[PDB]
């Protein structure tokens, strides 16, 4: 007789998917949900490299960062994982890790002199250089601050004020010296105890030196606790001190804000990034989720340890 | 039903008729159709309402008591684990649901043809039905669109059916 049969479709696609029970099921059709393409390491916007210097080295003015000098705008700054130049005179940076988040949001700054090094009064600005922060063979100090010491055996109470007439946020940095012994304090500041009073429209702190002889790092037994703040447009901040003071000399006017984050790798500067730029690279392929790197930039597919995420769309391909 | 049809490229589910006029494939498009809308909606909900990958956490002060970020570090790592599991599992779940769904649609199309034909045809080992009567292209299309007329052919099918057994 005549025959009418019911049947399904078979193709040639062998892309296989895995199910909650059976696996490697050859389906007629399937989507790859996991973005696992060739990382593949002008164009759009161009990035910058912190070279042998760290973010601290890139902002503190570590003498050897004189190479870094010249990078005002960028798309994605590049830091080495263990740079040679961090904090040559041993110490810490208060809130460095939210300032790096701030710079995850900064694409261009303008560095300018907020306080002249010689305009701090009858105080020695031409001194205050260390071998830990030596520039070349010659010794030196951080370029964005000045290490003021006594003039003619007296270090008076100095006071200056900066008014952000720029109309934009200004990143300002300074620090307090924590000498190793009392004699270092007396030799540099010609008194036994000192203070640093920082007061802005909103900021308010009084710091005092903590004198103790920490183990030697780069040959120094003393420390320095550096601090940073954002002077908002219209704010007039005032610095007052009679010792143990790393004067601000240069500040950064945030010129442009956006979403340029940072990483710690050593690949060549890579521009023309896609929606998601990763350390390995930036692939245009837009599968819902990716798995190249956990540390990503821009709107990014979620990192997942998976190696295959193929969603079954067609039916079980079984030809003949 | 053992195997699929590379020749039926009209949809996932359908028919292969073979009569006096000849033999041909032709997909059942209402069912194919409902399956496509269903799997499309499933995929859309999976992709769109997937999860909030963006770390909306403000992290105003992050952690930082320990040298490296301590709490948000392991929080993010644990969230990574949470979906790394959920997504693998959801893929599996929905893929076997899709295969069981395709299987159910096939089963249902077959049962519809069976309920139409009843006595006027014989069931065959695999997916196929052999008529006890001559089913031209009009009769074939009547079966497909669901308008098969049993009393029309019931007498012819009766005579043939009772003849094959001597």
């Amino acid at each position: 007789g005549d025959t009418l049969c019911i049947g399904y479709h078979a193709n040639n696609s062998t892309d296989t998917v895995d199910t909650l029970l059976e696996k490697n099921v050859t389906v007629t059709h399937s989507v790859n949900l996991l973005e696992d393409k060739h990382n593949g390491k002008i164009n759009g916007k161009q990035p910058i490299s912190l070279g042998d210097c760290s973010f601290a080295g890139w902002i503190l003015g570590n003498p050897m960062c004189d190479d870094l000098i010249g990078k005002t705008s960028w798309s994605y700054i590049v830091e080495k994982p263990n740079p040679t130049n961090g904090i040559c005179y041993p110490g810490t940076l208060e809130d460095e890790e939210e300032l790096r988040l701030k710079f995850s949001g900064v694409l261009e700054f303008s560095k300018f002199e907020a306080f002249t090094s010689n305009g701090w009064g009858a105080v020695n600005s031409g001194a205050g250089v260390t071998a830990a922060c030596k520039f070349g063979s010659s010794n030196s100090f951080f370029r964005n601050m000045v290490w003021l010491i006594h003039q003619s055996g007296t270090y008076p109470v100095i006071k200056r004020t900066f008014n952000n007439t720029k109309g934009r946020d200004v990143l300002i940095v300074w620090g307090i010296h924590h000498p190793a012994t009392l004699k270092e304090h007396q030799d540099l500041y010609k008194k036994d105890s000192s203070y640093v009073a920082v007061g802005s429209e909103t900021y308010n702190r009084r710091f005092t030196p903590e004198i103790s002889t920490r183990p030697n790092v780069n040959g120094q037994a003393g420390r320095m606790t550096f601090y940073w703040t954002m002077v908002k447009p219209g704010e007039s901040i005032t610095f007052e001190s009679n010792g143990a003071f790393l004067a601000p000399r240069y500040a950064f006017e945030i010129v442009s804000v956006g979403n340029g984050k940072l990483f710690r790798s050593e690949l060549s500067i890579e521009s023309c990034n896609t929606t998601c730029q990763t350390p390995k690279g930036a692939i245009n392929t837009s599968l819902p989720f990716q798995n190249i790197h956990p540390i990503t930039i821009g709107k990014c597919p979620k990192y997942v340890k998976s190696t295959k995420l193929r969603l079954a769309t067609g039916l079980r391909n079984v030809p003949s | 039903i053992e195997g699929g049809w590379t020749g039926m490229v009209d949809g996932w589910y359908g028919y292969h008729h073979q009569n006096e006029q000849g033999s041909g494939y032709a997909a059942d498009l209402k069912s194919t159709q409902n399956a496509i809308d269903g799997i499309t909606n499933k995929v859309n909900s999976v992709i769109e309402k997937m999860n909030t990958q963006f770390t909306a956490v403000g992290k105003e002060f992050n952690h930082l008591e320990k040298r490296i970020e301590n709490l948000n570090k392991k929080v993010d790592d644990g969230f990574l684990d949470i979906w790394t599991y959920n997504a693998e599992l959801l893929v599996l779940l929905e893929n076997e649901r899709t295969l069981d769904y395709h299987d159910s649609n096939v089963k249902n199309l077959y049962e519809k043809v069976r309920s139409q034909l009843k006595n006027n045809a014989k069931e065959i080992g695999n997916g196929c039905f052999e008529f006890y009567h001559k089913c031209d292209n009009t009769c074939m299309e009547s079966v497909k669109n669901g308008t098969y007329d049993y009393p029309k052919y019931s007498e012819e099918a009766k005579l043939n059916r009772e003849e094959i057994d001597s």
Partner: antibody
């Protein structure tokens, strides 16, 4: 190459059947499909309907269901739209376009038609 | 059913000033093939329409590099650098993967704002 020739302009009264034709040349008829869209004066409407040369099959727009009948002549590679029960609101400029014939493939509107004015009053 | 909302119905664009057109969908427009489906197309007054973008990121062979199609998920855009003269016209969203597929409303361009 790109040759999608619609029918001539047509003028009728409400309640009469209308028939539009779209010719096509080249190797572009590989039993591929053809869809038709509506464009009301000044503002376009959504798709009207589609048909597959490979597998006789038609998808019609909603609330037109009952008036729209579409055909294909594979021998002349020609598609046909036929709207019954004409309305004054139906007065509009129609259009043809390419489409892929089996559902295993999706859709592609690579060509377009010369346009056919249809007036109903 | 699908709803294609186009927020920028009217667009006065100074020649040479890249502008964008936004299509927003009610549901997601991905498909079994894995390819999101919206194919932008343009129409000139008294001239039959012609498409420009294939899926979300393919340019029609006959499309200048100015016409760039973007978008992901449910919200999608179309930006044209240095908008030229013939670029003026009416634009439309495209088929949602759901058979009731919706062109949406229209968006018009101007020579120089």
């Amino acid at each position: 190459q790109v040759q999608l020739v619609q029918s001539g302009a047509e003028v009728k009264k409400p309640g009469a059947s209308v028939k539009v034709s779209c010719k096509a040349s080249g190797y572009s008829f590989s039993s591929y499909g053809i869809s038709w869209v509506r464009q009301a004066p000044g503002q376009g409407l959504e798709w009207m309907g589609w048909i597959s040369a490979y597998n006789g099959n038609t998808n019609y727009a909603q609330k037109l269901q009952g008036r729209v009948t579409m055909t294909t002549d594979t021998s002349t590679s020609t598609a046909y739209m036929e709207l019954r029960s004409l309305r004054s609101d139906d007065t509009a400029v129609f259009y043809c376009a390419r489409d892929r014939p089996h559902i295993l493939t999706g859709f592609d509107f690579d060509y377009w038609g010369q346009g056919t004015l249809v007036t109903v009053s | 059913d699908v709803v294609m909302t186009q927020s920028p119905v009217s667009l006065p664009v100074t020649l040479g000033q890249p502008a964008s057109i936004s299509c927003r969908s009610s549901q997601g427009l991905v498909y079994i093939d894995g390819n999101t489906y919206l194919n932008w197309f343009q129409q000139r007054p008294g001239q039959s329409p012609r498409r420009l973008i294939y899926n979300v990121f393919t340019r029609d062979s006959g499309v200048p590099d100015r016409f760039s199609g973007s978008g992901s998920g449910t919200d999608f855009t179309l930006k044209i650098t240095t908008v030229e003269a013939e670029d003026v016209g009416v634009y439309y969203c495209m088929q949602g993967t759901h058979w009731p597929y919706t062109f949406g409303q229209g968006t018009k361009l101007e020579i120089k704002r």
